[PDB]
Symmetry: C3
Subunit: 137 residues, 3 copies
């Protein structure tokens, strides 16, 4: 495993709302929960910015994280991400936030502590370009 | 290359509908075909769950796969994924299924065996958190 | 870092429109700018194909790139990608193009040289399948 520093921004986290964790040893992602104080309605076509109450610091520039929709919420309820895929840079230290977009025609309720997205840590490569007139092998 | 076990769930696979394969030596993804018995209409804004007739077992927890829209179908026909990006965990052993979402204003027909998404195998990192009061280097 | 060959297809690139570059040492992605000659309107629900004026050649089959929405444009303006996520194969040598999709209810103007998406280089794994009757460890 790789160590990622995490700062708790809302005292509910770790008390009434658990920290993100892998469901199983073979899980690729961690479910991300929202830290709101009362249930929130997301109308058809509405986008709402939902806080997580946590900040992470990946630090290692060979690593990033992406925020993805949950499969069931996205397929069954059309509850996905307004930016489609959220990209977390290694030097980002602010709160993780979810752009929650209801792409369906049905109203949806988000309760405090609900899992609304998933977080996946991926290696990334920092490219340097070489400008050429023609491509070569 | 890396070996991924594949179980055929529908006898058409490998007979009338080919197994997923890289188009070229330099392809990042494999086209994923649907295993339906008759053509299916996907109306504007409709989401339909489409089977592939295959199950995979990635097994290695340092590896995952993602299901992505095809570029031409998504750009030209608005045929994309209802969950936007499908994440396949290393310990998932069920059938691969596509959440096919028509985001366009035109009706679309999916024929048996059509390529509707693409599958990409990516390394992933399992993070362990360290809860801190302030971030450090 | 890893060297990626880049061919300039429009003489504005590197003169009036900068080459893609990482904003910070810890950035995971590079902002991708559009190479159009006059401002372009993107109406609600409209998809437009926007050129970048550059081609890249990743070459290494263990590497790919993805094109993702920008977070603010996607969350605030609903300016995302019609194919949701663009996948760039290592053997692709054509112009990078953005499927720009306005998922919002507000008209949006794209100016020449605007950053409209981001590009991320990721390692990928080329799988070989082993067809089995039952999965094993
Ligand atoms: O869904 C998202 C996308 C981004 N970010 C964070 C992590 C990014 O590194 C940072 C800056 O976003 P940019 O506008 O620079 O992409 O915002 C989120 O909290 N959620
Ligand atoms: O588009 C998708 C997304 C997920 N899955 C499979 C692989 C996942 O590991 C499994 C469980 O999904 P979750 O609800 O746990 O994300 O479903 C698919 O078949 N297709
Ligand atoms: O948003 C996108 C998606 C793809 N491509 C390029 C890179 C791919 O390797 C190539 C071929 O696309 P396919 O139809 O084979 O996926 O098009 C783009 O320019 N932009």
């Amino acid at each position: 495993h790789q160590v990622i520093q995490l700062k708790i921004l809302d005292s509910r986290i770790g008390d009434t709302i658990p920290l993100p964790a892998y469901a199983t040893d073979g899980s690729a992602g961690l479910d991300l929960r929202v830290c709101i104080s009362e249930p929130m309605q997301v109308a058809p076509q509405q986008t709402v910015l939902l806080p997580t109450g946590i900040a992470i610091y990946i630090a290692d520039p060979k690593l990033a994280a992406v925020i993805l929709p949950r499969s069931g919420l996205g397929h069954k309820n059309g509850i996905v991400l307004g930016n489609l895929v959220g990209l977390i840079d290694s030097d980002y230290q602010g709160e993780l936030k979810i752009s929650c977009w209801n792409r369906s025609q049905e109203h949806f309720t988000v309760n405090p502590g609900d899992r609304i997205a998933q977080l996946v840590f991926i290696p990334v490569v920092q490219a340097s370009f070489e400008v050429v007139n023609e491509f070569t092998e």
